[PDB]
Design a protein around this motif. Sequence first.
Motif, PDB file in Angstrom:
ATOM      1  N   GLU A 102       0.793  -1.214   0.000  1.00 53.15           N
ATOM      2  CA  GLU A 102       0.000   0.000   0.000  1.00 53.15           C
ATOM      3  C   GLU A 102       0.829   1.270   0.000  1.00 53.15           C
ATOM      4  O   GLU A 102       2.007   1.231   0.386  1.00 53.15           O
ATOM      5  CB  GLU A 102      -0.910   0.025   1.235  1.00 53.15           C
ATOM      6  CG  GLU A 102      -0.200   0.214   2.581  1.00 53.15           C
ATOM      7  CD  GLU A 102      -1.055   0.087   3.834  1.00 53.15           C
ATOM      8  OE1 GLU A 102      -2.135  -0.536   3.795  1.00 53.15           O
ATOM      9  OE2 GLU A 102      -0.651   0.594   4.878  1.00 53.15           O
ATOM     10  N   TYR A 103       0.353   2.429  -0.425  1.00 53.17           N
ATOM     11  CA  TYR A 103       1.134   3.636  -0.166  1.00 53.17           C
ATOM     12  C   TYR A 103       1.019   4.090   1.280  1.00 53.17           C
ATOM     13  O   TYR A 103       0.088   3.711   2.022  1.00 53.17           O
ATOM     14  CB  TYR A 103       0.698   4.791  -1.021  1.00 53.17           C
ATOM     15  CG  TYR A 103       1.193   4.608  -2.415  1.00 53.17           C
ATOM     16  CD1 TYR A 103       2.463   5.062  -2.768  1.00 53.17           C
ATOM     17  CD2 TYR A 103       0.402   3.924  -3.343  1.00 53.17           C
ATOM     18  CE1 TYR A 103       2.938   4.869  -4.059  1.00 53.17           C
ATOM     19  CE2 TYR A 103       0.868   3.728  -4.629  1.00 53.17           C
ATOM     20  CZ  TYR A 103       2.126   4.196  -4.975  1.00 53.17           C
ATOM     21  OH  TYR A 103       2.602   3.977  -6.261  1.00 53.17           O
ATOM     22  N   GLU A 126      -0.440   7.734   9.113  1.00 48.65           N
ATOM     23  CA  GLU A 126       0.829   7.142   9.505  1.00 48.65           C
ATOM     24  C   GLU A 126       2.031   7.868   8.900  1.00 48.65           C
ATOM     25  O   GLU A 126       3.187   7.479   9.100  1.00 48.65           O
ATOM     26  CB  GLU A 126       0.904   5.717   9.075  1.00 48.65           C
ATOM     27  CG  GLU A 126      -0.101   4.812   9.750  1.00 48.65           C
ATOM     28  CD  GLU A 126      -0.071   3.367   9.274  1.00 48.65           C
ATOM     29  OE1 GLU A 126       0.420   3.085   8.167  1.00 48.65           O
ATOM     30  OE2 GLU A 126      -0.557   2.515   9.993  1.00 48.65           O
ATOM     31  N   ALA A 127       1.798   8.912   8.106  1.00 45.08           N
ATOM     32  CA  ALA A 127       2.893   9.644   7.483  1.00 45.08           C
ATOM     33  C   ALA A 127       3.876  10.286   8.453  1.00 45.08           C
ATOM     34  O   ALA A 127       3.588  10.492   9.637  1.00 45.08           O
ATOM     35  CB  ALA A 127       2.315  10.733   6.600  1.00 45.08           C
ATOM     36  N   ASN A 128       5.099  10.551   7.984  1.00 46.52           N
ATOM     37  CA  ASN A 128       6.085  11.188   8.832  1.00 46.52           C
ATOM     38  C   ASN A 128       6.888  12.284   8.126  1.00 46.52           C
ATOM     39  O   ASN A 128       6.729  13.440   8.545  1.00 46.52           O
ATOM     40  CB  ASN A 128       6.978  10.090   9.405  1.00 46.52           C
ATOM     41  CG  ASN A 128       8.026  10.591  10.386  1.00 46.52           C
ATOM     42  OD1 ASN A 128       9.164  10.150  10.368  1.00 46.52           O
ATOM     43  ND2 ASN A 128       7.755  11.499  11.286  1.00 46.52           N
ATOM     44  N   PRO A 129       7.721  12.107   7.061  1.00 46.27           N
ATOM     45  CA  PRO A 129       8.348  13.217   6.360  1.00 46.27           C
ATOM     46  C   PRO A 129       7.264  14.067   5.715  1.00 46.27           C
ATOM     47  O   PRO A 129       6.385  13.527   5.053  1.00 46.27           O
ATOM     48  CB  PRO A 129       9.216  12.621   5.304  1.00 46.27           C
ATOM     49  CG  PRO A 129       9.027  11.152   5.346  1.00 46.27           C
ATOM     50  CD  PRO A 129       8.073  10.834   6.465  1.00 46.27           C
ATOM     51  N   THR A 151       7.714  11.416  -3.938  1.00 46.81           N
ATOM     52  CA  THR A 151       7.860  11.043  -5.337  1.00 46.81           C
ATOM     53  C   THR A 151       7.244   9.650  -5.470  1.00 46.81           C
ATOM     54  O   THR A 151       7.601   8.747  -4.688  1.00 46.81           O
ATOM     55  CB  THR A 151       9.337  10.955  -5.768  1.00 46.81           C
ATOM     56  OG1 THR A 151       9.905  12.262  -5.653  1.00 46.81           O
ATOM     57  CG2 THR A 151       9.500  10.409  -7.180  1.00 46.81           C
ATOM     58  N   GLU A 152       6.309   9.401  -6.389  1.00 50.51           N
ATOM     59  CA  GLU A 152       5.805   8.037  -6.573  1.00 50.51           C
ATOM     60  C   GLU A 152       6.006   7.612  -8.024  1.00 50.51           C
ATOM     61  O   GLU A 152       5.222   7.923  -8.908  1.00 50.51           O
ATOM     62  CB  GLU A 152       4.331   7.927  -6.226  1.00 50.51           C
ATOM     63  CG  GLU A 152       4.071   8.409  -4.804  1.00 50.51           C
ATOM     64  CD  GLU A 152       2.606   8.599  -4.408  1.00 50.51           C
ATOM     65  OE1 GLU A 152       1.759   8.794  -5.287  1.00 50.51           O
ATOM     66  OE2 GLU A 152       2.322   8.567  -3.209  1.00 50.51           O
ATOM     67  N   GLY A 200      12.909   6.179   1.388  1.00 47.97           N
ATOM     68  CA  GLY A 200      12.145   5.413   0.428  1.00 47.97           C
ATOM     69  C   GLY A 200      11.424   4.229   1.081  1.00 47.97           C
ATOM     70  O   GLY A 200      11.878   3.703   2.115  1.00 47.97           O
ATOM     71  N   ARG A 201      10.252   3.824   0.605  1.00 50.25           N
ATOM     72  CA  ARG A 201       9.593   2.609   1.066  1.00 50.25           C
ATOM     73  C   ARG A 201       9.027   1.896  -0.144  1.00 50.25           C
ATOM     74  O   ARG A 201       8.687   2.518  -1.162  1.00 50.25           O
ATOM     75  CB  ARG A 201       8.451   2.873   2.054  1.00 50.25           C
ATOM     76  CG  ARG A 201       7.359   3.855   1.652  1.00 50.25           C
ATOM     77  CD  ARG A 201       6.265   3.887   2.719  1.00 50.25           C
ATOM     78  NE  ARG A 201       5.129   3.047   2.373  1.00 50.25           N
ATOM     79  CZ  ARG A 201       4.379   2.410   3.288  1.00 50.25           C
ATOM     80  NH1 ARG A 201       4.622   2.478   4.608  1.00 50.25           N
ATOM     81  NH2 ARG A 201       3.307   1.730   2.834  1.00 50.25           N
TER      82      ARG A 201
END
Lengths: 132, 50
Positions: free
Chosen positions: A36-37, A42-45, A50-51, A98-99
Amino acid sequence: EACGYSDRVLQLTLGNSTITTQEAANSVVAYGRWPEYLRDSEANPVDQPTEPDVAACRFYTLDTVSWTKESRGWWWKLPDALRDMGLFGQNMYYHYLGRSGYTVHVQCNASKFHQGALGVFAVPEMCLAGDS
Amino acid sequence: TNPLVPSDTVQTRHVVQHRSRSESSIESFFARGACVTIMTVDNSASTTNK
Protein backbone atom coordinates in the motif's frame (compact mmCIF):
# COMPACT_ATOMS: atom_id res chain seq x y z
CA GLU A 1 -13.32 -23.10 -13.07
CA ALA A 2 -15.45 -24.81 -15.81
CA CYS A 3 -14.07 -22.14 -18.16
CA GLY A 4 -10.53 -23.56 -17.39
CA TYR A 5 -9.14 -21.26 -14.57
CA SER A 6 -6.42 -22.85 -12.43
CA ASP A 7 -4.46 -22.32 -9.25
CA ARG A 8 -1.46 -23.45 -11.22
CA VAL A 9 -1.84 -21.10 -14.18
CA LEU A 10 -1.28 -17.40 -13.57
CA GLN A 11 -0.52 -14.15 -15.32
CA LEU A 12 1.01 -11.21 -13.44
CA THR A 13 1.19 -7.72 -14.99
CA LEU A 14 2.95 -4.72 -13.54
CA GLY A 15 3.94 -1.69 -15.71
CA ASN A 16 5.11 -2.82 -19.19
CA SER A 17 5.79 -6.32 -17.87
CA THR A 18 3.99 -9.62 -17.78
CA ILE A 19 4.91 -12.98 -16.21
CA THR A 20 3.08 -16.13 -17.16
CA THR A 21 3.21 -19.47 -15.42
CA GLN A 22 1.54 -22.84 -16.08
CA GLU A 23 2.87 -24.66 -13.00
CA ALA A 24 2.33 -22.46 -9.93
CA ALA A 25 1.33 -23.61 -6.42
CA ASN A 26 -0.96 -20.64 -5.88
CA SER A 27 0.82 -17.45 -4.70
CA VAL A 28 1.52 -16.00 -1.24
CA VAL A 29 0.69 -12.62 0.22
CA ALA A 30 2.99 -12.07 3.20
CA TYR A 31 1.10 -11.79 6.47
CA GLY A 32 -2.05 -11.37 4.41
CA ARG A 33 -1.09 -7.73 3.71
CA TRP A 34 -1.06 -6.46 0.12
CA PRO A 35 1.36 -3.50 -0.54
CA GLU A 36 0.00 0.00 0.00
CA TYR A 37 1.13 3.64 -0.17
CA LEU A 38 1.87 5.43 3.06
CA ARG A 39 -1.39 6.73 4.60
CA ASP A 40 -1.72 10.29 5.95
CA SER A 41 -2.45 9.06 9.46
CA GLU A 42 0.83 7.14 9.50
CA ALA A 43 2.89 9.64 7.48
CA ASN A 44 6.09 11.19 8.83
CA PRO A 45 8.35 13.22 6.36
CA VAL A 46 6.18 16.20 5.35
CA ASP A 47 7.51 16.98 1.86
CA GLN A 48 5.59 15.83 -1.24
CA PRO A 49 6.64 12.23 -1.98
CA THR A 50 7.86 11.04 -5.34
CA GLU A 51 5.80 8.04 -6.57
CA PRO A 52 7.43 6.68 -9.78
CA ASP A 53 4.51 4.28 -10.39
CA VAL A 54 5.07 2.25 -13.67
CA ALA A 55 8.57 3.64 -14.15
CA ALA A 56 9.75 1.61 -11.14
CA CYS A 57 6.89 -0.78 -10.31
CA ARG A 58 7.68 -3.31 -12.94
CA PHE A 59 9.39 -6.71 -13.16
CA TYR A 60 13.22 -6.63 -13.04
CA THR A 61 15.12 -9.90 -13.79
CA LEU A 62 18.32 -10.53 -11.86
CA ASP A 63 21.33 -12.59 -13.00
CA THR A 64 20.43 -16.24 -13.28
CA VAL A 65 22.19 -18.60 -10.88
CA SER A 66 22.77 -22.34 -11.22
CA TRP A 67 21.40 -25.17 -8.98
CA THR A 68 23.52 -28.28 -8.68
CA LYS A 69 24.03 -31.30 -6.38
CA GLU A 70 26.58 -29.23 -4.46
CA SER A 71 24.45 -26.09 -4.03
CA ARG A 72 23.99 -25.06 -0.44
CA GLY A 73 21.73 -22.05 -1.00
CA TRP A 74 21.47 -18.42 -2.08
CA TRP A 75 20.42 -15.13 -0.50
CA TRP A 76 19.50 -11.58 -1.56
CA LYS A 77 18.41 -8.41 0.28
CA LEU A 78 15.65 -5.91 -0.63
CA PRO A 79 15.95 -3.21 -1.67
CA ASP A 80 19.70 -3.95 -2.21
CA ALA A 81 19.25 -6.50 -5.05
CA LEU A 82 17.36 -3.85 -7.02
CA ARG A 83 19.71 -0.88 -6.40
CA ASP A 84 20.87 -0.84 -10.03
CA MET A 85 17.50 -1.60 -11.60
CA GLY A 86 16.35 1.11 -13.99
CA LEU A 87 14.42 4.04 -12.57
CA PHE A 88 13.77 2.23 -9.25
CA GLY A 89 17.49 2.38 -8.46
CA GLN A 90 17.67 6.00 -9.63
CA ASN A 91 14.76 7.05 -7.48
CA MET A 92 16.28 5.18 -4.56
CA TYR A 93 19.70 6.87 -4.68
CA TYR A 94 18.32 10.40 -5.28
CA HIS A 95 16.26 10.41 -2.07
CA TYR A 96 17.07 10.17 1.64
CA LEU A 97 13.98 8.11 2.31
CA GLY A 98 12.15 5.41 0.43
CA ARG A 99 9.59 2.61 1.07
CA SER A 100 8.46 -0.20 -1.20
CA GLY A 101 6.60 -3.48 -1.37
CA TYR A 102 7.52 -6.29 -3.85
CA THR A 103 6.25 -9.11 -6.02
CA VAL A 104 8.99 -11.76 -5.89
CA HIS A 105 8.83 -14.44 -8.59
CA VAL A 106 11.35 -17.27 -8.38
CA GLN A 107 11.63 -19.40 -11.53
CA CYS A 108 13.01 -22.94 -11.86
CA ASN A 109 11.75 -25.53 -14.33
CA ALA A 110 13.04 -29.03 -14.99
CA SER A 111 11.28 -32.26 -16.18
CA LYS A 112 9.05 -35.06 -14.85
CA PHE A 113 12.20 -37.15 -14.39
CA HIS A 114 14.05 -34.59 -12.25
CA GLN A 115 13.50 -34.17 -8.54
CA GLY A 116 14.40 -31.64 -5.87
CA ALA A 117 12.87 -28.99 -3.68
CA LEU A 118 13.73 -25.36 -3.00
CA GLY A 119 12.44 -23.60 0.10
CA VAL A 120 11.92 -19.93 -0.82
CA PHE A 121 11.72 -17.71 2.22
CA ALA A 122 11.03 -14.00 2.59
CA VAL A 123 12.44 -12.85 5.95
CA PRO A 124 11.71 -9.34 7.42
CA GLU A 125 15.04 -7.93 8.83
CA MET A 126 17.16 -10.89 7.63
CA CYS A 127 20.22 -10.19 9.74
CA LEU A 128 23.02 -12.62 8.83
CA ALA A 129 26.00 -13.81 10.92
CA GLY A 130 29.59 -12.75 10.36
CA ASP A 131 32.76 -14.72 9.66
CA SER A 132 34.66 -13.69 12.80
CA THR B 1 9.92 36.05 13.78
CA ASN B 2 8.46 34.98 10.42
CA PRO B 3 5.66 32.43 11.27
CA LEU B 4 6.44 30.02 8.40
CA VAL B 5 5.53 26.39 7.98
CA PRO B 6 6.94 23.98 5.28
CA SER B 7 3.96 24.43 2.91
CA ASP B 8 4.99 28.10 2.62
CA THR B 9 8.20 27.33 0.73
CA VAL B 10 8.04 23.70 -0.49
CA GLN B 11 5.40 21.29 -1.83
CA THR B 12 3.86 19.24 0.97
CA ARG B 13 1.74 16.19 1.53
CA HIS B 14 -1.05 15.83 4.00
CA VAL B 15 0.20 14.46 7.29
CA VAL B 16 -1.88 13.73 10.37
CA GLN B 17 0.28 14.94 13.16
CA HIS B 18 0.16 12.96 16.38
CA ARG B 19 3.01 14.58 18.29
CA SER B 20 2.37 16.80 21.29
CA ARG B 21 4.28 19.31 23.46
CA SER B 22 3.22 17.61 26.73
CA GLU B 23 6.67 17.07 28.16
CA SER B 24 7.83 20.66 27.58
CA SER B 25 4.99 22.41 29.44
CA ILE B 26 6.50 24.64 32.24
CA GLU B 27 5.26 22.13 34.83
CA SER B 28 6.71 19.09 33.04
CA PHE B 29 10.00 20.88 32.37
CA PHE B 30 10.39 21.51 36.11
CA ALA B 31 8.68 18.35 37.50
CA ARG B 32 11.82 16.84 39.05
CA GLY B 33 13.53 17.04 42.46
CA ALA B 34 17.01 18.68 42.28
CA CYS B 35 19.79 18.65 44.89
CA VAL B 36 20.25 22.16 46.29
CA THR B 37 22.55 21.51 49.25
CA ILE B 38 24.36 18.96 51.39
CA MET B 39 24.36 19.56 55.16
CA THR B 40 26.93 17.87 57.45
CA VAL B 41 26.25 16.95 61.03
CA ASP B 42 27.90 14.66 63.53
CA ASN B 43 27.20 12.97 66.82
CA SER B 44 30.38 13.59 68.81
CA ALA B 45 31.12 14.51 72.43
CA SER B 46 31.26 18.34 72.77
CA THR B 47 34.67 19.15 74.35
CA THR B 48 36.19 22.60 75.38
CA ASN B 49 37.79 23.48 71.98
CA LYS B 50 35.16 21.75 69.70
